[PDB]
Amino acid sequence: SIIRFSVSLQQNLLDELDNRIIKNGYSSRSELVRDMIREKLVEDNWNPNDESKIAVLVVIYDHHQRELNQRMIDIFHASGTHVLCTTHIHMDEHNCLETIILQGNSFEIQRLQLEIGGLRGVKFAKLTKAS
Amino acid sequence: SIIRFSVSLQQNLLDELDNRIIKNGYSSRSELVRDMIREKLVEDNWAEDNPNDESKIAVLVVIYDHHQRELNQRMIDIFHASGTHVLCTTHIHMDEHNCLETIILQGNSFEIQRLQLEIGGLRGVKFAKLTKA
Known about the structure:
2 copies of one chain form a homodimer. Chain A is an alpha+beta fold. Chain A contains 5 helices and 5 strands; from the N terminus they run E-H-H-E-H-E-E-H-H-E. Chain A has helices spanning 11-24, 29-42, 68-79, 106-109, 112-118, and strands spanning 2-9, 53-62, 82-90, 95-104, 122-130. The first copy, chain A, has a 4-stranded antiparallel β-sheet. Strand 1 (2-9) of chain A pairs antiparallel with strand 1 of chain B, so a sheet runs across the interface. Chain A: One of its GO terms (molecular function) is sequence-specific DNA binding. Chain A: This is Putative nickel-responsive regulator. Chain A: Transcriptional regulator.
């Protein structure tokens, strides 16, 4: 049984999507989304309230932001997740790439990527589950 | 300033979408789909064989046993043979038999993925995953 729902997005993202569909010969927009959903479904991945799960969060952000760093800290503290180690490299005047080694439970860790990614100043956020 | 297109899905795919929304704390199907589209576009972008585009940034995450004989040197050999530029690496000691390492790389997609492939296929390497920026 097939269902449909509509997706909202900006012109910029739609342009990039349509360009790729033409370029790679995707049959439709739905097809690309289906394939990615399937991909996420079958993708390598890691259970209880095991509080010993390890993960790595990768974050690219504008390090000029006066309060961004404190906000990330507060989000980790609120989540009850432990930061074992962090590394910041400045890639250019604007951008810092940070790797964050995390430890906590599965539920909490899986919600960090979106929280951090939504902070203003943050340009990229991607979590990796160590398993 | 917003556009909507329809997506047609088998129920089981929609279920996977909906399950992930709740798991990761997405606010809607639209937000998650946008995220997926972005991630997919990056993949396809990296899937292009652009030898001359050496501007790509990635982080390789590796868990390995530092006790494995010659593994360290073997990994060193691989990086020296690699055309990628290592910007920074951090090694953290987890326990006796587990070291976690994050490797920040720059180069073209061919070299970066060849590196991932070669490291991941090593004895003593438990885990190897690449983040495409």
